Amino acid sequence: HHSSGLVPRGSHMQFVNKQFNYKDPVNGVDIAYIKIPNQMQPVKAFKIHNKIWVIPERDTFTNPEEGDLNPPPVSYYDSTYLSTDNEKDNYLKGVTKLFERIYSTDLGRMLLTSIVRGIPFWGGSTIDTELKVIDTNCINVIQPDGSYRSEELNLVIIGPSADIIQFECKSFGHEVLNLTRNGYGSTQYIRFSPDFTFGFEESLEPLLGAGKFATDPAVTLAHELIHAGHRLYGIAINPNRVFKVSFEELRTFGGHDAKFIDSLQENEFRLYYYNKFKDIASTLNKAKSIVGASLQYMKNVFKEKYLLSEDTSGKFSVDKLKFDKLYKMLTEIYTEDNFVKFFKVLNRKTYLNDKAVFKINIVPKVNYTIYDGFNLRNTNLAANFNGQNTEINNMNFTKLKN
Ligand SMILES: O=C(CS)Nc1n[nH]cc1-c1ccc(F)cc1
Numbered sequence: 001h002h003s004s005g006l007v008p009r010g011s012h013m014q015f016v017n018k019q020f021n022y023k024d025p026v027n028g029v030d031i032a033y034i035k036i037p038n039q040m041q042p043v044k045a046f047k048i049h050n051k052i053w054v055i056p057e058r059d060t061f062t063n064p065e066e067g068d069l070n071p072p073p074v075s076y077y078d079s080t081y082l083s084t085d086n087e088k089d090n091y092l093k094g095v096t097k098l099f100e101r102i103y104s105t106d107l108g109r110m111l112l113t114s115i116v117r118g119i120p121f122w123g124g125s126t127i128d129t130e131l132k133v134i135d136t137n138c139i140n141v142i143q144p145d146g147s148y149r150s151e152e153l154n155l156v157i158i159g160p161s162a163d164i165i166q167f168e169c170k171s172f173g174h175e176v177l178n179l180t181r182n183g184y185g186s187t188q189y190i191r192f193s194p195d196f197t198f199g200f201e202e203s204l205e206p207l208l209g210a211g212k213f214a215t216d217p218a219v220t221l222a223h224e225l226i227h228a229g230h231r232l233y234g235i236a237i238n239p240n241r242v243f244k245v246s247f248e249e250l251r252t253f254g255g256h257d258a259k260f261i262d263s264l265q266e267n268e269f270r271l272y273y274y275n276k277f278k279d280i281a282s283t284l285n286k287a288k289s290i291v292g293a294s295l296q297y298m299k300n301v302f303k304e305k306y307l308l309s310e311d312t313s314g315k316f317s318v319d320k321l322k323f324d325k326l327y328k329m330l331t332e333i334y335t336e337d338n339f340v341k342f343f344k345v346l347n348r349k350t351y352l353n354d355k356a357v358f359k360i361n362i363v364p365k366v367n368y369t370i371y372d373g374f375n376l377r378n379t380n381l382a383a384n385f386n387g388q389n390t391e392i393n394n395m396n397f398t399k400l401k402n
């Protein structure tokens with residue numbers, strides 16, 4: 001129960017930039033006290049990759065009206081969870097481990113690359129000839145000397161708010177702009193914990209009885225990262241579009257569930273976002289000045305993000321083939337169903353598929369590995385998804401109140 005097995009092959013992790021300990025000292029750079037736009041006492045945070053920070057704390061920050069961990073009068077509460085430094089260390093290492101698990105698959109390298117290149121658009125100016133950052137897409141990073149530096153980022157992983165098992169991908173809004181739906185994108189905050197997971201039922205083809213299994217937390221995280229991709233490229237479906245469950249939930253799950261969005265509706269969605277991208281090319285084109293760094297250069301960052309073409313003259317435009325390629329990647333190829341296939345784990349078959357929650361600890365290599373998750377090769381857990389079977393692999397799952 002000692003090594004974490006964070007580097008199965010090679011010398012160093014391939015996505016996460018440091019093997020952090022929660023007690024490592026603050027430096028100006030990738031370990032720092034930070035402040036979110038909205039006040040608060042600064043919180044210790046770790047920069048795991050360009051544009052991506054992890055805050056090993058319960059989320060009492062991103063919502064003015066959720067500033068406390070106590071229950072109101074399918075959910076789970078524990079006000080003591082993630083209050084000690086040991087737990088915050090375990091949270092950071094568990095999150096690091098899941099990013100490496102995701103990045104060990106071809107699909108996950110594609111997705112995390114798209115996320116990192118998906119910088120929120122500089123649409124903050126009211127002068128249509130000036131690019132400017134939107135400050136809710138930044139954090140304030142304290143330095144060794146005590147001064148603050150403003151830093152753009154794309155993604156924050158943070159612990160859950162009061163309901164420990166409510167995971168979601170949310171972001172700060174703009175008074176006028178709809179950043180998640182106008183091509184712009186915004187910094188995404190994912191509420192998530194690697195220290196709990198969910199159970200579902202499944203019969204594996206001698207009496208043929210029902211099995212009680214647990215969801216692999218790498219799938220759950222990849223689900224939330226897929227939402228983040230939609231939202232970072234500003235092409236999320238309006239949350240007011242629902243079944244009876246939102247379109248955006250069904251699109252993220254993928255598989256046959258996504259086929260319920262009728263194809264004519266998809267085409268309409270695709271055209272709308274094509275036009276949003278065209279508007280962004282135009283805005284870059286009309287740009288004379290930049291507030292807060294070079295005009296033409298920030299111009300290139302967004303040429304890269306949106307895959308825009310440039311003519312001999314210097315003018316940007318949207319290419320239909322490059323647009324269809326990026327949009328299909330983000331909406332059709334990055335899905336939960338496809339991650340299940342790449343990981344080869346058992347998982348709910350449809351987005352609705354239980355009421356069981358389980359405490360887990362994926363940090364020890366003996367419990368869970370980057371390559372195999374719970375289904376450890378060359379043990380009995382390798383077959384029939386025995387590693388996710390909460391009866392067979394009972395030492396890895398503790399059932400909690402529902
Ligand atoms: O269902 C949603 C929509 S983002 N979020 C959640 N709240 N608590 C758990 C989840 C969740 C998210 C993704 C999964 F793959 C499995 C469970």
Ligand SMILES: [Zn+2]
Binds near residue numbers: 223224227249
């Ligand atoms: Zn979701």
